[PDB]
Design a protein around this ligand. Structure first.
Ligand code: MMC
Ligand SMILES: [Cl-]
Length: 177
C-alpha cells in the first residue's frame, strides 16, 4: 500500500480511497459501498457500521439498508463508545463509515468527533475504531445510482419545504449552534 497506516498503526487501510474536500479524511466511492454490502470483503471485515448523521426526518425518507441514524454527538458517543463494537474474530476488522446528505459538513464532523473521544479514552495509540471512512457524495450521490440498496426507495432533502418546522425543532436539540 502507498498510503499511511490506520489509526493504531497496526496495518494499512483496506479500502481504495478517492479524493474529497477534507484533505485529512479518507473517502470511499458508492461503488466501494456496494462492495461491502454485497459481502465482497466478508473474509476480512467482521463488521462495518454505516452511520447516517442526517436529521431523523431525512433518514426516515430513505436511507441505505443497514445504516443506523445517529445525528446527535451524544447518541453517537452512546452507541459506539459506551460498549464498543468488536470483531468476533481476532483476525477480522471493524470499520466505520460516516455520511450525510452531501457528506460535506455533518458526516465529517461526526467522524472527527468520534476520533477525538476514541483517543481520549484509550492508551496511545490503541483505538476501538482505527479505520474510518466518509462515503463521498453522501446519500444524494448514492440514491440515484443504487436505489435498490435504499429503503425506502426515496430521497428527502434536509431543506425539504414541508419539513421546515421539524428542522428548527431538531436544531434546538443540539449540544451547540
Ligand atoms: C478522523 Hg475521522
Ligand atoms: Cl449534538
Amino acid at each position: 500500500d502507498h498510503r499511511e497506516l490506520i489509526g493504531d498503526y497496526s496495518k494499512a487501510f483496506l479500502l481504495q480511497t478517492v479524493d474529497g474536500k477534507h484533505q485529512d479524511l479518507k473517502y470511499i466511492s458508492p461503488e466501494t459501498m456496494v462492495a461491502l454490502l454485497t459481502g465482497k470483503f466478508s473474509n476480512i471485515v467482521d463488521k462495518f457500521v454505516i452511520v447516517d448523521c442526517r436529521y431523523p426526518y431525512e433518514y426516515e425518507g430513505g436511507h441505505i439498508k443497514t445504516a443506523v441514524n445517529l445525528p446527535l454527538e451524544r447518541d453517537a458517543e452512546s452507541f459506539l463508545l459506551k460498549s464498543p463494537i468488536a470483531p468476533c474474530s481476532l483476525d477480522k476488522r471493524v470499520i466505520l463509515i460516516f455520511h450525510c446528505e452531501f457528506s460535506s459538513e455533518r458526516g465529517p464532523r461526526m467522524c472527527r468527533f468520534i476520533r477525538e473521544r476514541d483517543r481520549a479514552v484509550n492508551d496511545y495509540p490503541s483505538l476501538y475504531y482505527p479505520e474510518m471512512y466518509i462515503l463521498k457524495g453522501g446519500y444524494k450521490e448514492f440514491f440515484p445510482q443504487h436505489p435498490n440498496f435504499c429503503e425506502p426507495q426515496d430521497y428527502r432533502p434536509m431543506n425539504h419545504e414541508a419539513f421546515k418546522d421539524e428542522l428548527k425543532t431538531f436544531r434546538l436539540k443540539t449540544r451547540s449552534w
